[PDB]
Design a protein around this ligand. Structure first.
Ligand SMILES: Nc1ncnc2c1ncn2[C@@H]1O[C@H](COP(=O)(O)OP(=O)(O)OP(=O)(O)O)[C@@H](O)[C@H]1O
Ligand SMILES: Nc1ncnc2c1ncn2[C@@H]1O[C@H](COP(=O)(O)OP(=O)(O)OP(=O)(O)O)[C@@H](O)[C@H]1O
Ligand SMILES: Nc1ncnc2c1ncn2[C@@H]1O[C@H](COP(=O)(O)OP(=O)(O)OP(=O)(O)O)[C@@H](O)[C@H]1O
Ligand SMILES: Nc1ncnc2c1ncn2[C@@H]1O[C@H](COP(=O)(O)OP(=O)(O)OP(=O)(O)O)[C@@H](O)[C@H]1O
Ligand SMILES: Nc1ncnc2c1ncn2[C@@H]1O[C@H](COP(=O)(O)OP(=O)(O)OP(=O)(O)O)[C@@H](O)[C@H]1O
Ligand SMILES: Nc1ncnc2c1ncn2[C@@H]1O[C@H](COP(=O)(O)OP(=O)(O)OP(=O)(O)O)[C@@H](O)[C@H]1O
Ligand SMILES: [Mg+2]
Ligand SMILES: [Mg+2]
Ligand SMILES: [Mg+2]
Ligand SMILES: [Mo]
Ligand SMILES: [Mo]
Ligand SMILES: [Mo]
Ligand SMILES: [Mo]
Ligand SMILES: [Mo]
Ligand SMILES: [Mo]
Ligand SMILES: [Mo]
Ligand SMILES: [Mo]
Ligand SMILES: [Mo]
Ligand SMILES: [Mo]
Ligand SMILES: [Mo]
Ligand SMILES: [Mo]
Ligand SMILES: [Mo]
Ligand SMILES: [Mo]
Ligand SMILES: [Mo]
Ligand SMILES: [Mo]
Ligand SMILES: [Mo]
Ligand SMILES: [Mo]
Ligand SMILES: [Mo]
Ligand SMILES: [Mo]
Ligand SMILES: [Mo]
Ligand SMILES: [Mo]
Ligand SMILES: [Mo]
Ligand SMILES: [Mo]
Ligand SMILES: [Mo]
Ligand SMILES: [Mo]
Ligand SMILES: [Mo]
Ligand SMILES: [Mo]
Ligand SMILES: [Mo]
Ligand SMILES: [Mo]
Ligand SMILES: [Mo]
Ligand SMILES: [Mo]
Ligand SMILES: [Mo]
Ligand SMILES: [Mo]
Ligand SMILES: [Mo]
Ligand SMILES: [Mo]
Ligand SMILES: [Mo]
Ligand SMILES: [Mo]
Ligand SMILES: [Mo]
Ligand SMILES: [Mo]
Ligand SMILES: [Mo]
Ligand SMILES: [Mo]
Ligand SMILES: [Mo]
Ligand SMILES: [Mo]
Ligand SMILES: [Mo]
Ligand SMILES: [Mo]
Ligand SMILES: [Mo]
Ligand SMILES: [Mo]
Ligand SMILES: [Mo]
Ligand SMILES: [Mo]
Ligand SMILES: [Mo]
Ligand SMILES: [Mo]
Ligand SMILES: [Mo]
Ligand SMILES: [Mo]
Ligand SMILES: [Mo]
Ligand SMILES: [Mo]
Ligand SMILES: [Mo]
Lengths: 268, 245, 245, 268, 245, 268
C-alpha cells in the first residue's frame, strides 16, 4: 500500500472496486474531537417528563462540564410519535416522517438550551466542529438536536414507514464521525434487561453484553434503536456504548467518572 | 398499503459525474437531447460527482479524515456539475435547486418550469454510515432514494458505458466482460466485483416501495436517454424486486 | 386613504390544527375538497397547531419557560401540519412555503402554482407580548394579520365545529350552548368565555383596514369550505367593523 | 393547582378558556438571562449623530463590560423615517413599513459592531441566548438589531401605517423575555420632561414616574414608543425602565452602577 | 469565441435610487408603465440606492469606516427600494428576489412570472476595491455586470434626467451643460467631471462580451422606458465597444 | 474640509463628482482588526499536497496563535482548475466560473478546519468580524474560505473567462478591509524569482521588490494573481505583502516573528 497506489486506484476504478475499497481502508485515521463525550438525553424518557427529570440533569451537566467536554443531543418523544401516527395513517413514506420528527428534537434542544444559556452552554448546529465552545473552561459543552440529516433521503425499514434512524442513531453517528471517546444514552431505566422492564415483572438486569449476544436473545429492538446496534458493529471509533438511567440523581456524573453504572453494550 | 406516490408524474434522470467530466464533447449533445425532452416529460435531473470527488478523497484520506468528512466533500462536486448543467439549460427556463427545495418544494418548482437540476448526492454528510472509508451513499443511491420516496414514474441512470457488464469494461479483465441486458438487484448484490452503480443502490432497492425497474443507459450515444424515458430497452434494466399492488 | 391592497385576488384559508389532529378521516376529504378548489381560487392555505402545541406548553410551562419561549415551540407544530397537508397536495403542484417566502414572494409563488401552504402562526417568537403565560398571537391571529395586510378577498377559518356558540359545545356547559350564525368582533371581545378563535384575533380585527368579515365553518362537513369561499353562509360570520371606502 | 390539573385543561379546553389561562399563570417562572442588562442605543438620538456621540459610548461599553453583562440593541433613525415617508405615500400598509425599518436598525448594528470587533464584542442574531459571548470575561456583551421580528405580521396602530412596535419595543421585549435585570434606553435628552424639551423652553424634569401617571399627564407618546408603556404594564420580569442621555459622558456607566441618572419609569 | 448567452431573451432595467426617492409622484407612473410592459418583455428590474445611501456614507465616514464597510450599507438601501417597487407590482405577480436567486435561479423565476425585482448593487461587500472611500461598484455597475454575464438583450438605465450632459445639469455649471444623445464608454472614461452613471460602469463596459449599447433615459417622462425597450432613441446611448461576432 | 462640507456634497452631488470624492478621502481611517495577520494557505501549492504539507502547517498554526492573532484563508487548487477547464470549454462566462471555484476553496477550508477543531480554531464565515474567537487566548485564530464574494458579478479579465480575482485577491482584500497588520501568502516556493523556478534552472531569488519594479521586469502574473498587485497599489492599510514557502518547516512561524524569509512585495 501507498498513497500512489491509492491515488492511482482512485483515478482508474469505480469506487465499488474491491481493490480501491481495500486501499482506502489502509488510510490513516484522524479523530476530530477525541476528548469529547456524546450524551443523548431521551425525549420520551426524560424531556417529556418535565422539570422533575430535566432540572437535575441540567445541574449535572453544569457540574460535569468542569471536568468533561460534552456534546449533548436531544431525543424527540411523544410529539414525534403523534406526527408519525398522523402521517403514517395518511400513507406518507418514511422520508416524509423523518422530516417531521426533526422538528420535535429541535423543540427539545431549544427548551434544554434555554435552561443552560445562563451557564454559557449554547444550542448549536454542527456540534462535532463546535471548536470554540468546546475549548473554553467557561463552556466545554454544547446542545444539539439528535435527529440525523437524512430527511426525505431516509432509508426506510424493511416494514412500515416509521423512520428507522432516529435520535439514538443521530447521536451515535456524530460520536462515531468525530472520533469521540464515549457515547452515553440517558434514558429512564437502569439499563438493559432480559425483557422490557415496564412490562415484565421478573426481567433480569444485564450489566454488559455484545451486539451478537443481544441478537441471539432477541434484544435487537429493546432499549436502543435496532439499527444503532448494526452501526455500532461497523464503527471505526466508538466500539461500545453505555445506557444509563437519567432519573437517578448523579447517574450521568458517575458514568462520566468511569463508574460502571447501567449497561455497556459492545460491538464485539 | 404501501405509501402513496407524492409525484407520480415525475421522471428522475441521474447524470453520471464521469459523463460531465468529458466536457463539451459529451455535454453539448446531452444538453440538446434534454432540451428536446422538456416538452415531453416533467424532469428532475440530478448530477453525480465524477473525478473531482476522487481527488478530494485522495487528499482527505491522506489527511486521515473519516467517512463522514468525505461525504459532503464529494457531494460538493455533484452540486458543481449540477450548476454547470443548469447554466447550459438556463435559456430553456431550467435552474439548479438546492436540496431543501428538492425535498419540500419540488411540486411548485415543476409547476413553474419544465425541469430542474439538483445534486444526486443525498445529505448523509457527517452522519454517513461507517465501515468503508469511502462514502457509501453516493449519487445513484441519492437519486433512487428520491425517486422512490416521490413514487416517481421512473429513474434512469445515464452513464459513460452501455450498461452493466460482468466485469469492468474499461479494466484489467475487460476481455471477459459480457454485457447484461437485464438483471435484478438481488443478483447484483451477491456478486463481488465492481459495478457502474453504487452498491448501496442495491440495498435501497431492496426496501423500495414503488420503483420496479431502473435502466442504466449510455449518455454518450444520442437518443438513448429519450428511448429509455419511453420505456424502450436500450441499456441494462435493473429489476428492484418491487411488484404492483 | 386606507393602504392599498397588495393581493386583492387572494383567498386565505386557515385550517385548524385540531382538524389535522383527526388524521386521515378528516384530512382525506379536506384534501379532495381543496383539490377541486384549486382551479377556482388563488389560495394561501395556512395551518394551525392543534394538540401537539398543548403538549409542548405542558412541558415548557413545567420547565418554567416564559411566553416568548413557548411561542415558537407551538408555531413549529403548525409548520408540521403544513408540511403534512402540502405533501398530500404535492401531486397537484402545491408545496409548503416558509414565512419569509410568504411575506416577500407570495405573488411569484401564486403565479407559479395555484395554491401554497404555510404556517398560520405569526413570527412573534421571543418578542411575543407578555401578560398571559400562553402565547396570544396564534394561528387565527397570524392568518388574519396576513389576509388583512395583503388586502385579500377573504379569510375563511376551517374548524372542527359548526362555528361559534355561546359556550363550548364540547364542554361542561355544552347543554346551554347556542349557535351564533352571525356576530361582530366587538361583541365577542366583551364576552369572557372560551371561543374557537384566538382572543387576539378580535383585537387585530379592530385595527383592520380591509377584511370586513371572516367566516368560521366546519371542515368536517364536505362542501362547507367550498360554499364559504363563494360567500355562502354556512357557519358563523364574524363582522370585523371595517366598512367599504 | 397541579401539573395534572394544568395538563388536563391544556388537553381538554381551548387556549381561550379562562380556567386554562388561570392554571397556566400559576406556572413556575424561569429567568433565562437574569444577570444581563439590555441597553438600547438610539438611532436618531445617537448613532445618526456620528463619531461625537458614538465613540464615547463605544468606550463606555468596552469599560462597562468588565463589570456588567450587556445586550446592546440598536435603533433605526432618520433613514427609517425616510423609508416610512416614501412607503406611506404609496399607500403601503404597516406590515410592509415594518420590514423596511429593520434594514436600518441592521445597518446601525453593523456600524457599531465594527467599532467593537477588536474588543471581542460580536453582532449577533439571538442575543438573549448568546450563551457563549455572555459567559466570557473577554466578551460579556453582544450587539443586536433592535427591531422586532413581526414584519408583515406587525399589528398596525389605530391610525396610520407607521409600525407602532419599533426599536424601543424590540429591545424591551427581549429584556422581558429573557428575564434580564435592567433595561436602559440611551437617548439624547436627560430623561422625561413635562413636555418635549426640544420644543418647550420651560419643561420640567421628571426623575421618576409610573405609566398611569404618564398617561394622566399625556406623556404616552413622548420619549418612548407609547406601546412600550403598555407592554411594560403587562411585563412579568422587567417592571421598570430607565431613560438616560447617552450624549453625557459616563452616563451609561453611571446608570449601570446604580446611579439614578435620567428618568425611571415604573409599571405601577 | 465569446462566452455563450445564458438568458438571451432577458431585458434588464435599472431604476435609479433617486427616482424612487421622489416617492409616489414618480413611482406611481413608473409602476403603471411597468405593468403595461409585463406582457411585452421578460424583465429583471433592479433598483439603485439613492439618498439614504448618502446618509449612511455620511455616518460611516464620520465613524472612519473603510470602503468595504460602506459597500453593503449602501446596498441595503437599493434592496429596500426593490422591496418597495416589488410591493407595488405584487398584484401583477411580481416579487423581489434575493441575490443568490438572481444569480442561480433567474431562469425558473422568469418562467414562473413575467418580471422580478432585485437589488442592482453587486455583492462586493467587504471585498470592495480600495482606493476611493466611496464604494466604486454601485447600482449601474452591478446591473451591467449581470446583464452582460447573462448575455441579455439589453440594459436600460432609468434616471431622473434626460441622459448624460457635458456637466451636471443640476449643478453649479449647469448653464454650460449640453445634452449628449450618443457617446462611447471610452470617451466618457477619459472625461473627469461628474456623470449620472458610476465610473466603474465604463470599466466593466471595456471588458464586456455581449452588451453593445446601454441607453440612459428619463423615468420621469412616461413612455420613455417603453420606447427604449423597443430600441428607440429617447435618451443617451452609451456604446460599450463590444461588436457582433 | 468639514463634516458639513462632506455631508452637503454627499446630498447635493453625484458620487462621481471629484469634489465629493476628494472630501470623502479626508475622512478618518478606522482599522477594524489592526492586530491580526491574514495568511493564505495555497490550494495547489499546499493543501492539494496532503498530509506532508498540511500537518506541519497545522502544528505551526496551533503554536503561532499563542502569540499571534490569525485569519487563515484557503486557496482552491487543482479541482478548481478542472472546473474552470470544463466550464470554459462549454463557453460559460467568468461569473459562472467564479461560483464554481468558491466550492473548492470551501472544501479546503472544511478539511483544514477539521484538523484544527480540537485546538479550538473554527471555520467561519465573516472572518474579519469574528470578534469572539479572535479575543480568546484559547482560540486567537479562525479559518475562512479564500474566494471573493463576487461570483456572477465577477469582472472578467481582458481576455478569456478565468475569473481574475481568486483566492489571493480574496485574502488580500480581507486584510485590507479589516486594516490588518500583515498579509502572508503561503506557497510552495521560497519566494519570487526572476522567472518561474519550476521551469527555469537559473532563476535568481528576489528578496524585496515593488509592484512597479515587478511590472517593469514582467513579473506581473508570476507567484501572485496579477490583479492583486494592482489592488496592493490602491490599498489604504496593507501596503506590502510577504510570500513564503509553507513546505519549509517553521517558515510561517518565522515570518510571524518578523524574520525576512521569502519575498516582500511593496506597493511603492
Ligand atoms: N429489554 C429492555 N431493557 C430496557 N428497556 C427497554 C427494553 N425493551 C424496551 N425498553 C424500553 O425502551 C424505552 C426507551 O425508549 P424511548 O423511546 O423511551 O427512549 P428515548 O431515548 O426516550 O427515545 P426518544 O428520545 O426519541 O423519545 C425504555 O423506556 C424501556 O421501556
Ligand atoms: N461491471 C461493470 N459494468 C460496467 N461498468 C463498470 C463495471 N465495473 C466498473 N465499471 C466502470 O464504471 C465506470 C463508470 O464510473 P462511475 O460509475 O464511477 O462514474 P459515474 O456514475 O459517472 O460517477 P458518479 O457516481 O459520481 O455520478 C465505467 O466507465 C466502467 O469503467
Ligand atoms: N364558544 C365556542 N364556540 C365553539 N367552539 C368552542 C367555543 N369555546 C370553546 N370551543 C372549542 O374550541 C374547539 C376548537 O379548538 P381550537 O380552536 O383550539 O382548535 P384549532 O382552531 O383547530 O387549533 P389551532 O388554533 O392550533 O389551529 C372546539 O372543538 C370547541 O370545543
Ligand atoms: N416629554 C418628553 N421628554 C423627553 N423627550 C421627549 C419628550 N417628548 C418627546 N421627546 C423626544 O423624543 C426623542 C426620542 O425619540 P427618538 O426617535 O429620537 O429616539 P430614538 O431611540 O433615537 O429612536 P430610533 O432609535 O428608532 O431613532 C427625544 O429626542 C425627544 O426630543
Ligand atoms: N454629466 C451629467 N449628466 C447628467 N446628470 C449628471 C451629470 N453629472 C451629475 N449628474 C447628476 O446625476 C444625478 C443622478 O444622480 P445619481 O446618478 O446619483 O442617482 P441614481 O442613479 O438615481 O442613484 P443610484 O446610483 O443609487 O441608483 C442627476 O440628477 C444629475 O444631477
Ligand atoms: N517568478 C516566479 N517566482 C516564484 N514562483 C512562480 C513564479 N512564476 C510562477 N510561479 C509559480 O506560481 C505558483 C503559485 O501559484 P499557485 O496557483 O500554485 O498558488 P496557490 O496559492 O497554490 O493557488 P490556489 O491556492 O488557488 O491553488 C508557484 O508554484 C510557482 O511555480
Ligand atoms: Mg456510475
Ligand atoms: Mg380554533
Ligand atoms: Mg445614476
Ligand atoms: Mo430545517
Ligand atoms: Mo433548523
Ligand atoms: Mo432557540
Ligand atoms: Mo437557539
Ligand atoms: Mo453556532
Ligand atoms: Mo453560527
Ligand atoms: Mo439550521
Ligand atoms: Mo437545519
Ligand atoms: Mo440549514
Ligand atoms: Mo459544520
Ligand atoms: Mo453547519
Ligand atoms: Mo459556535
Ligand atoms: Mo463561532
Ligand atoms: Mo436557496
Ligand atoms: Mo433554501
Ligand atoms: Mo435546512
Ligand atoms: Mo431557505
Ligand atoms: Mo434551517
Ligand atoms: Mo430560499
Ligand atoms: Mo427556504
Ligand atoms: Mo427562504
Ligand atoms: Mo430572514
Ligand atoms: Mo432565503
Ligand atoms: Mo436573513
Ligand atoms: Mo432578514
Ligand atoms: Mo438579516
Ligand atoms: Mo456585519
Ligand atoms: Mo456582522
Ligand atoms: Mo452568532
Ligand atoms: Mo451562528
Ligand atoms: Mo439573519
Ligand atoms: Mo433575520
Ligand atoms: Mo434568518
Ligand atoms: Mo435563537
Ligand atoms: Mo437564531
Ligand atoms: Mo454566538
Ligand atoms: Mo461563538
Ligand atoms: Mo456559538
Ligand atoms: Mo430567500
Ligand atoms: Mo435564498
Ligand atoms: Mo449564499
Ligand atoms: Mo437559500
Ligand atoms: Mo450559503
Ligand atoms: Mo454559497
Ligand atoms: Mo457557503
Ligand atoms: Mo464543515
Ligand atoms: Mo464548518
Ligand atoms: Mo460563525
Ligand atoms: Mo454564526
Ligand atoms: Mo457562532
Ligand atoms: Mo454560508
Ligand atoms: Mo456563502
Ligand atoms: Mo450565505
Ligand atoms: Mo459579517
Ligand atoms: Mo456573515
Ligand atoms: Mo463566531
Ligand atoms: Mo458568535
Amino acid at each position: 500500500n501507498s498513497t500512489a497506489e491509492l491515488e492511482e486506484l482512485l483515478m482508474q476504478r469505480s469506487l465499488t472496486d474491491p481493490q480501491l475499497q481495500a486501499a482506502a481502508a489502509a488510510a490513516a485515521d484522524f479523530r476530530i474531537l477525541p476528548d469529547a463525550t456524546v450524551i443523548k438525553i431521551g425525549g420520551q424518557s426524560v424531556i417529556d417528563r418535565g422539570r422533575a427529570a430535566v432540572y437535575p440533569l441540567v445541574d449535572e451537566i453544569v457540574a460535569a462540564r468542569k471536568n468533561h467536554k460534552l456534546l449533548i443531543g436531544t431525543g424527540a418523544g411523544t410529539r414525534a410519535r403523534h406526527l408519525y401516527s398522523i402521517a403514517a395513517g395518511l400513507g406518507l413514506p418514511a422520508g416524509v416522517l423523518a422530516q417531521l420528527g426533526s422538528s420535535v428534537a429541535d423543540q427539545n434542544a431549544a427548551m434544554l438550551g434555554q435552561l443552560l444559556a445562563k451557564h454559557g452552554i449554547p444550542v448549536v448546529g454542527g456540534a462535532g466542529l463546535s471548536a470554540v465552545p468546546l475549548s473554553l473552561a467557561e463552556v466545554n459543552a454544547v446542545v444539539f438536536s439528535g435527529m440525523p440529516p437524512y430527511k426525505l433521503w431516509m432509508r426506510p425499514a424493511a416494514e412500515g414507514v416509521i423512520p428507522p434512524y432516529r435520535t439514538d442513531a443521530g447521536c451515535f453517528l456524530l460520536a462515531e464521525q468525530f472520533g469521540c471517546k464515549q457515547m452515553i444514552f440517558v434514558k429512564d431505566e437502569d439499563g438493559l434487561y432480559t425483557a422490557n422492564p415496564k412490562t415484565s415483572k421478573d426481567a433480569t438486569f444485564i450489566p454488559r453484553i455484545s451486539v451478537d449476544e443481544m441478537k441471539a436473545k432477541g434484544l435487537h429492538d429493546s432499549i436502543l434503536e435496532f439499527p444503532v446496534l448494526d452501526l455500532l458493529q461497523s464503527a471505526q471509533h466508538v466500539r461500545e456504548v453505555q445506557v444509563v438511567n437519567g432519573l437517578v440523581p448523579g447517574n450521568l456524573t458517575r458514568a462520566l467518572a468511569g463508574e460502571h453504572v447501567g449497561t455497556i453494550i459492545t460491538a464485539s | 398499503k404501501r405509501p402513496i406516490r407524492l409525484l407520480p408524474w415525475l421522471q428522475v434522470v441521474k447524470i453520471g459525474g464521469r459523463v460531465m467530466d468529458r466536457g463539451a464533447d459529451a455535454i453539448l449533445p446531452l444538453v440538446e437531447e434534454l432540451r428536446k425532452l422538456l416538452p415531453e416529460h416533467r424532469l428532475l435531473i440530478l448530477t453525480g460527482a465524477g473525478v473531482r470527488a476522487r481527488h478530494v478523497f485522495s487528499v482527505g484520506l491522506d489527511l486521515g479524515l473519516p467517512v463522514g468528512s468525505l461525504a459532503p466533500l464529494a457531494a460538493s462536486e455533484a452540486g458543481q456539475n449540477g450548476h454547470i448543467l443548469a447554466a447550459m439549460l438556463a435559456s430553456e427556463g431550467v435552474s439548479y435547486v438546492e436540496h431543501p427545495t428538492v425535498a419540500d418544494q419540488l411540486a411548485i418548482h415543476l409547476s413553474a418550469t419544465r425541469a430542474v437540476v439538483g445534486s444526486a448526492f443525498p445529505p448523509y454528510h457527517h452522519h454517513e454510515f461507517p465501515g468503508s472509508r469511502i462514502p457509501p451513499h453516493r449519487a445513484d443511491t441519492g437519486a433512487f432514494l428520491l425517486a422512490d420516496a416521490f413514487g416517481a414514474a421512473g429513474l434512469t441512470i445515464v452513464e459513460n458505458v452501455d450498461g452493466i457488464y460482468t466485469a469492468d469494461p474499461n479494466g484489467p479483465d475487460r476481455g471477459q466482460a459480457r454485457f447484461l441486458p437485464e438483471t435484478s438487484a438481488t443478483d447484483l448484490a451477491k456478486s463481488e466485483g465492481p459495478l457502474p452503480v453504487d452498491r448501496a443502490l442495491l440495498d435501497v432497492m431492496a426496501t423500495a416501495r414503488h420503483i420496479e425497474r431502473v435502466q442504466v443507459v449510455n449518455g454518450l450515444v444520442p437518443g438513448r436517454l429519450t428511448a429509455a424515458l419511453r420505456g424502450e430497452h436500450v441499456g441494462t434494466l435493473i429489476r428492484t424486486g418491487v411488484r404492483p399492488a
